[PDB]
Amino acid sequence: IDRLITGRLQSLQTYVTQQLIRAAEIRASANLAATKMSECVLGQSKRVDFCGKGYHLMSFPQSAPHGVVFLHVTYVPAQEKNFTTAPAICHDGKAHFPREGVFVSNGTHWFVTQRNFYEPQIITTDNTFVSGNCDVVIGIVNNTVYDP
Amino acid sequence: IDRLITGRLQSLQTYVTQQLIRAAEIRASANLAATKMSECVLGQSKRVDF
Amino acid sequence: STECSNLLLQYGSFCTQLKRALTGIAVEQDKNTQEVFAQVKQIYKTPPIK
Amino acid sequence: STECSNLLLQYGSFCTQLKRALTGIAVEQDKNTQEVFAQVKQIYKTPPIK
Amino acid sequence: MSLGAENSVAYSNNSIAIPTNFTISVTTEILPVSMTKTSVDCTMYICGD
Amino acid sequence: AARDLICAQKFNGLTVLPPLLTDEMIAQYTSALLAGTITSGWTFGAGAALQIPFAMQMAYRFNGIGVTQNVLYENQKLIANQFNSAIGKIQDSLSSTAS
Ligand SMILES: *[C@@H]1O[C@H](CO)[C@@H](O[C@@H]2O[C@H](CO)[C@@H](O)[C@H](O)[C@H]2NC(C)=O)[C@H](O)[C@H]1NC(C)=O
Ligand SMILES: *[C@@H]1O[C@H](CO)[C@@H](O[C@@H]2O[C@H](CO)[C@@H](O)[C@H](O)[C@H]2NC(C)=O)[C@H](O)[C@H]1NC(C)=O
Ligand SMILES: *[C@@H]1O[C@H](CO)[C@@H](O)[C@H](O)[C@H]1NC(C)=O
Ligand SMILES: *[C@@H]1O[C@H](CO)[C@@H](O)[C@H](O)[C@H]1NC(C)=O
Numbered sequence: 001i002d003r004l005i006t007g008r009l010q011s012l013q014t015y016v017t018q019q020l021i022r023a024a025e026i027r028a029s030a031n032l033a034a035t036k037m038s039e040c041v042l043g044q045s046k047r048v049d050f051c052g053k054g055y056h057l058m059s060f061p062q063s064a065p066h067g068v069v070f071l072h073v074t075y076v077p078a079q080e081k082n083f084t085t086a087p088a089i090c091h092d093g094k095a096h097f098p099r100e101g102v103f104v105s106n107g108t109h110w111f112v113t114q115r116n117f118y119e120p121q122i123i124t125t126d127n128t129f130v131s132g133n134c135d136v137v138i139g140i141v142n143n144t145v146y147d148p
Numbered sequence: 149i150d151r152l153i154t155g156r157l158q159s160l161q162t163y164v165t166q167q168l169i170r171a172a173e174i175r176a177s178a179n180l181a182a183t184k185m186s187e188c189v190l191g192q193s194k195r196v197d198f
Numbered sequence: 199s200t201e202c203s204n205l206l207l208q209y210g211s212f213c214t215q216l217k218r219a220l221t222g223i224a225v226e227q228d229k230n231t232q233e234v235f236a237q238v239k240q241i242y243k244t245p246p247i248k
Numbered sequence: 249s250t251e252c253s254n255l256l257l258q259y260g261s262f263c264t265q266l267k268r269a270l271t272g273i274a275v276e277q278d279k280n281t282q283e284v285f286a287q288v289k290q291i292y293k294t295p296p297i298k
Numbered sequence: 299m300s301l302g303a304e305n306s307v308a309y310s311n312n313s314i315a316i317p318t319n320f321t322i323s324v325t326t327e328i329l330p331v332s333m334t335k336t337s338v339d340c341t342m343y344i345c346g347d
Numbered sequence: 348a349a350r351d352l353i354c355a356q357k358f359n360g361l362t363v364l365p366p367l368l369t370d371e372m373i374a375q376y377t378s379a380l381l382a383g384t385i386t387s388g389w390t391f392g393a394g395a396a397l398q399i400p401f402a403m404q405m406a407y408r409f410n411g412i413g414v415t416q417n418v419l420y421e422n423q424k425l426i427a428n429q430f431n432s433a434i435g436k437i438q439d440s441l442s443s444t445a446s
């Protein structure tokens with residue numbers, strides 16, 4: 001009986017130790033799931049590759065046996081085109097930098113457009129600001145800037 | 149032989165339990181490194197001291 | 199030794215669960231390395247101009 | 249007890265690995281407190297105006 | 299084993315590429331939360347009345 | 348005559364399995380990540396890789412941290428020299444100190 005008691009006690013202690021380690025792993029995954037519920041679903045996340053692959057827009061929770069399932073809605077750019085760019089535009093001895101965007105060119109004319117989508121616009125003084133002269137910035141180009 | 153078997157079984161069980169705990173610690177460090185590769189290298193992070 | 203194996207067979211399935219734990223650790227290490235380093239879908243390269 | 253020490257010496261190196269584990273935990277606690285609280289490099293103090 | 303398809307981006311010091319369209323993609327992520335709760339009686343398991 | 352520790356470890360029934368990914372494949376993955384980061388910015392982590400000049404990528408990073416991009420475009424050589432000196436310093440600190 002003492003032999004059997006020692007063997008069954010060892011078996012039960014092994015089971016309890018394995019259950020404790022698996023419970024620690026499950027608690028780590030549950031903490032990650034709670035963080036994902038707080039940040040993906042209840043808001044919008046700027047963290048890269050958190051809340052899915054791409055630029056995160058929305059997330060939805062779904063129930064599951066012994067877990068949770070997230071449906072991450074993301075924004076993926078699709079069709080790109082080659083363009084010629086420049087860091088600044090030299091106009092009347094002044095360096096013009098874009099406010100929020102990027103200078104592009106279709107070969108002949110220069111446009112300023114946003115970075116994640118191709119929506120070209122005429123370079124005016126409303127979307128560009130002035131800082132310095134044209135002999136400091138490397139790669140500056142000559143163009144006119146429309147004044148409304 | 150039974151005494152030697154019990155001693156070596158206890159030694160092997162202790163080694164396996166220690167390796168399991170070390171594996172949990174290494175997996176936590178690997179998850180942190182994967183998050184750092186996802187956020188630092190693949191983008192720009194606004195989190196302070198990350 | 200055959201007699202030691204015949205006496206060790208009386209102790210049940212401790213060897214099988216030790217082998218299962220070590221196999222789980224060994225698979226988990228490759229999973230850690232794969233989830234840290236294999237984050238890019240294509241193998242990019244630098245142009246020869248530097 | 250000398251007889252118990254002589255009989256305990258036959259069991260190998262359980263005592264050393266248990267002492268190593270407890271020493272690792274003891275160092276880890278001080279590392280935890282240092283990495284939580286000691287995030288600042290200089291001891292700033294409040295001006296006398298409040 | 300093969301790590302992936304070989305790619306070589308056309309880097310230049312006056313060339314940029316800007317997307318003109320997009321896709322809306324929905325992905326799925328599964329995370330365990332809890333496991334099955336257990337309770338063991340010693341006297342019934344080891345001895346059995 | 349000088350028996351190794353690894354020989355006794357192997358002979359007593361303990362076997363060390365090789366990793367699935369060799370160090371050459373790890374270096375290839377790291378090289379791909381570096382080439383994507385250098386030549387495409389953050390665009391290779393959200394879809395297809397989009398080329399951009401590195402100075403304009405650095406101006407995007409400075410606009411990210413809250414500094415106007417004319418600070419980069421008028422101080423580009425100083426920032427490049429500071430980065431090259433920092434990489435030289437981290438090489439020296441890695442070669443000298445062994446801890
Ligand atoms: C770049 O875009 C501009 C503006 O869209 C183009 O200029 C116009 O092109 C049309 C097409 O012949 C003409 O009818 C307009 O008179 C042009 N506008 C001006 C102000 O000249 C330009 O052709 C485009 N360049 C290329 C190479 O496609
Ligand atoms: C942007 O992409 C969408 C698809 O994601 C394009 O929409 C498709 O256009 C083709 C061409 O006319 C149609 O045959 C499909 O039925 C459209 N799919 C839809 C409406 O779901 C869209 O044309 C693209 N925009 C461009 C190229 O400017
Ligand atoms: C842009 O130019 C490169 C090299 O000139 C070419 O390989 C590529 O197909 C072009 N188009 C796009 C959309 O990248
Ligand atoms: C831009 O105009 C100025 C003055 O008109 C001239 O000195 C400069 O060479 C021009 N830039 C280029 C690239 O020709």
Ligand SMILES: *[C@@H]1O[C@H](CO)[C@@H](O)[C@H](O)[C@H]1NC(C)=O
Binds near residue numbers: 247311312
């Ligand atoms: C820009 O690139 C071209 C071709 O790669 C090269 O000839 C030129 O020297 C580069 N510009 C500078 C300032 O090095």
